[PDB]
Design an enzyme around this catalytic site. Sequence first.
Site, PDB file in Angstrom:
ATOM      1  N   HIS A  55       0.794  -1.260   0.000  1.00  0.00           N
ATOM      2  CA  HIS A  55       0.000   0.000   0.000  1.00  0.00           C
ATOM      3  C   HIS A  55       0.829   1.316   0.000  1.00  0.00           C
ATOM      4  O   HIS A  55       0.560   2.264   0.752  1.00  0.00           O
ATOM      5  CB  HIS A  55      -0.993   0.037   1.146  1.00  0.00           C
TER       6      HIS A  55
ATOM      7  N   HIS B 230       1.779   1.549  -5.600  1.00  0.00           N
ATOM      8  CA  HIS B 230       0.412   1.139  -5.779  1.00  0.00           C
ATOM      9  C   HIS B 230      -0.467   2.322  -6.187  1.00  0.00           C
ATOM     10  O   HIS B 230      -1.391   2.166  -6.964  1.00  0.00           O
ATOM     11  CB  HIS B 230      -0.064   0.507  -4.479  1.00  0.00           C
TER      12      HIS B 230
ATOM     13  N   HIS C  45      -5.679   7.619  -3.067  1.00  0.00           N
ATOM     14  CA  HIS C  45      -6.651   6.630  -2.596  1.00  0.00           C
ATOM     15  C   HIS C  45      -6.242   5.863  -1.307  1.00  0.00           C
ATOM     16  O   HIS C  45      -7.109   5.547  -0.471  1.00  0.00           O
ATOM     17  CB  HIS C  45      -7.034   5.688  -3.760  1.00  0.00           C
ATOM     18  N   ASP C  46      -4.955   5.516  -1.161  1.00  0.00           N
ATOM     19  CA  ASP C  46      -4.509   4.933   0.088  1.00  0.00           C
ATOM     20  C   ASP C  46      -3.535   5.839   0.869  1.00  0.00           C
ATOM     21  O   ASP C  46      -2.598   5.319   1.504  1.00  0.00           O
ATOM     22  CB  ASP C  46      -3.867   3.573  -0.151  1.00  0.00           C
TER      23      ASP C  46
ATOM     24  N   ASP D 253      -8.027  -0.291  -8.352  1.00  0.00           N
ATOM     25  CA  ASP D 253      -7.419  -0.767  -7.111  1.00  0.00           C
ATOM     26  C   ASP D 253      -6.796  -2.149  -7.250  1.00  0.00           C
ATOM     27  O   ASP D 253      -5.720  -2.403  -6.733  1.00  0.00           O
ATOM     28  CB  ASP D 253      -8.457  -0.785  -6.005  1.00  0.00           C
TER      29      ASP D 253
ATOM     30  N   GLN E 238      -5.126 -16.980  -4.346  1.00  0.00           N
ATOM     31  CA  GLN E 238      -5.251 -16.165  -5.552  1.00  0.00           C
ATOM     32  C   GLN E 238      -6.413 -16.623  -6.459  1.00  0.00           C
ATOM     33  O   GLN E 238      -7.299 -15.800  -6.791  1.00  0.00           O
ATOM     34  CB  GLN E 238      -3.906 -16.045  -6.300  1.00  0.00           C
TER      35      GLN E 238
HETATM   36  C1  8G6 Z   1      -4.651  -7.008  -5.436  1.00  0.00           C
HETATM   37  C2  8G6 Z   1      -4.913  -8.149  -4.552  1.00  0.00           C
HETATM   38  C3  8G6 Z   1      -4.451  -9.485  -4.626  1.00  0.00           C
HETATM   39  C4  8G6 Z   1      -5.017 -10.114  -3.531  1.00  0.00           C
HETATM   40  N1  8G6 Z   1      -4.951 -11.393  -3.055  1.00  0.00           N
HETATM   41  C5  8G6 Z   1      -5.606 -11.670  -1.965  1.00  0.00           C
HETATM   42  C6  8G6 Z   1      -6.437 -10.737  -1.186  1.00  0.00           C
HETATM   43  C7  8G6 Z   1      -6.470  -9.498  -1.705  1.00  0.00           C
HETATM   44  C8  8G6 Z   1      -7.290  -8.494  -1.012  1.00  0.00           C
HETATM   45  C9  8G6 Z   1      -7.300  -7.196  -1.484  1.00  0.00           C
HETATM   46  C10 8G6 Z   1      -8.066  -6.239  -0.861  1.00  0.00           C
HETATM   47  C11 8G6 Z   1      -8.814  -6.597   0.237  1.00  0.00           C
HETATM   48 CL1  8G6 Z   1      -9.755  -5.383   0.997  1.00  0.00          CL
HETATM   49  C12 8G6 Z   1      -8.819  -7.886   0.724  1.00  0.00           C
HETATM   50  C13 8G6 Z   1      -8.053  -8.837   0.091  1.00  0.00           C
HETATM   51  N2  8G6 Z   1      -5.766  -9.181  -2.863  1.00  0.00           N
HETATM   52  N3  8G6 Z   1      -5.702  -7.985  -3.485  1.00  0.00           N
HETATM   53 MG    MG Z   2      -7.511   1.588   0.318  1.00  0.00          MG
HETATM   54 ZN    ZN Z   3      -5.581   0.493  -2.822  1.00  0.00          ZN
END
Ligand code: 8G6
Ligand code: MG
Ligand code: ZN
Length: 308
Positions: free
Chosen positions: A78, A82, A116-117, A213, A265
């Site tokens: 973050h 990003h 955004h973050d 995002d 994933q």
């Molecule tokens: C880009 C990316 C890959 C990935 N893999 C697992 C979990 C998450 C995730 C992202 C945002 C939130 Cl709020 C919760 C989980 N993400 N995000």
């Molecule tokens: Mg955010």
């Molecule tokens: Zn973000």
Amino acid sequence: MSICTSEEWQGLMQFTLPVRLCKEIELFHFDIGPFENMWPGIFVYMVHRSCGTSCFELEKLCRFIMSVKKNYRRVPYHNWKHAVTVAHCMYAILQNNHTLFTDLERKGLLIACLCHDLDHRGFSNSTSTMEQHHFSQTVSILQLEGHNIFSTLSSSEYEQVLEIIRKAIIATDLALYFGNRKQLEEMYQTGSLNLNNQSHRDRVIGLMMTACDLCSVTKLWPVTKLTANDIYAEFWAEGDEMKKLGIQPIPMMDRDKKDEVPQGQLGFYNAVAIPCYTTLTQILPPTEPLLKACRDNLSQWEKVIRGE
Ligand SMILES: Cc1cc2nccc(-c3ccc(Cl)cc3)n2n1
Ligand SMILES: [Mg+2]
Ligand SMILES: [Zn+2]
């Protein structure tokens, strides 16, 4: 609110994007990764092409950028990378839908993407508090001396972009994404989706914000892989902060269970990412290539899981 040096903002001012990236950067799957010193530069470039060289005083705009940079933190995911990655994806969405978005929207969405973050610590929000904080940080940076990039706007133009930006930022709270995308699904299919309806606009913009995002899932495989490690390096560092008080981290935030990741994933692509880009492609057909890339990477994670 930290602020940039004179030398930082002046250095951004003399930046020219090298020409060899001029086509790359219009691609949905463009990876900024190799070009760390260019990231602020890149954002200036994108603003200039989406919103025009005479849309923000170069000076105040570089001031704004370099300072937003210094209010990101050097956490794995973050971070400033990003924010520029998110911005870029929004740039690509804006470019392939130009006739649908107002100037006011185009400027507000790129700025909001960048912010955004803001000041993310890396730890999980585990109502929309983080995002409301991010938006407040954005207000603080704006209020600063020589920093109000919207100074040349009217009283209602200002009081309107701020609102475009608040809504955009909030929308990056994945908990809201679900109900919003459902909402958008219904509308579109019933034929009742009205872009002239402001509340419907906000919904679509919401989805755009999600799609940006999450855009790491839509890059080339070699890039998508490395970037998974970055997100995961934050869950794990948080899970360690759990362990340090004898607590059990949920199995995602435990780096002992590291080979869980490809299944995680795949799950995430199926539950979250594919629906997101699916719906977005349906409302904005020119964003199709994000869906295609996402599918391609889904297909890669299967192969890791199947041991190929
Ligand atoms: C880009 C990316 C890959 C990935 N893999 C697992 C979990 C998450 C995730 C992202 C945002 C939130 Cl709020 C919760 C989980 N993400 N995000
Ligand atoms: Mg955010
Ligand atoms: Zn973000």
